């Protein structure tokens, strides 16, 4: 849904999406061939589903067709120091894909902005909408517009027939954060069909026991998960499916 959005925020006002109480499957993203770039700076570009993370932040904005590789830790430049800045320690992935056919219009649409210059470099994971007038020392800028001081935000000129370097490109950067809070967004769990009346190693929601499974007459309470014996030995489980 967030990839199929109708409106995309500017780089200086990149939208952040926080995901919780949800199971995220990356198989569709991996198998989607519409992405022109899937370089990931995380621990593994395939074990993302297997890994368990507490929370995920998605940053989506539109930049030039070029400098897509420029969105990375370090890599000093205009976009790095005066636009959305990626921290030097980043464990997420960078996804880029072309969207010329829908977001590009004739006449050079100016709905997309970007920050040209500020007093200091932008800290990682920062959003700036103040758009205060930049000063160049002399500061003769008590009026709306003065010398050496103008609007720091510049409007992108995007054209479908323009060179691919100047063509609209979509980048979505996802960040994985580890905190003291318990994990709430991890990959789907694969479950096989149960087999009964056979000594089979089983993993019932982390129980990890071995034995023979057979139907039972005991009445588990609805909230209960797995029973126990006098000697605290697991002797009954409730099937989650």
């Amino acid at each position: 849904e967030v990839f199929n959005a109708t409106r995309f925020a500017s780089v200086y006002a990149w939208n952040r999406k926080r995901i919780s109480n949800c199971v995220a499957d990356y198989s569709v993203l991996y198998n989607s061939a519409s992405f022109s770039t899937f370089k990931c700076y995380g621990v593994s570009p395939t074990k993302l589903n297997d890994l368990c993370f507490t929370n995920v932040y998605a940053d989506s904005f539109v930049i030039r067709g070029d400098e897509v590789r420029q969105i990375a830790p370090g890599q000093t430049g205009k976009i790095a120091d005066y636009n959305y800045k990626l921290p030097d320690d980043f464990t997420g992935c960078v996804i880029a894909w072309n969207s010329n056919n829908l977001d590009s219009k004739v006449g050079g649409n100016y709905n997309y902005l970007y920050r040209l210059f500020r007093k200091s470099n932008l800290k990682p994971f920062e959003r700036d909408i103040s758009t205060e007038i930049y000063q160049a020392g002399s500061t003769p800028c008590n009026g709306v517009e003065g010398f050496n001081c103008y609007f720091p935000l510049q409007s992108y000129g995007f054209q479908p027939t323009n060179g691919v370097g100047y063509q609209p490109y979509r980048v979505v950067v996802l960040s994985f954060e580890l905190l003291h809070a318990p994990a709430t967004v991890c990959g789907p769990k694969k479950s096989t069909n149960l087999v009964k009346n056979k000594c089979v190693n089983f993993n019932f929601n982390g129980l990890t026991g071995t034995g023979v499974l057979t139907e039972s007459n005991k009445k588990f309470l609805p909230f209960q998960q797995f029973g126990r014996d006098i000697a605290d030995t697991t002797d009954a489980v409730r099937d989650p499916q």
């Binding site: 022109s36 067709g65 070029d66 897509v68 590789r69 060179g163 691919v164 370097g165 490109y169």
Partner: peptide, 9 residues
């Protein structure tokens, strides 16, 4: 004449 590719041109 110019190449048509973001990675290299």
């Amino acid at each position: 004449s110019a190449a048509d590719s973001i990675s290299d041109k």
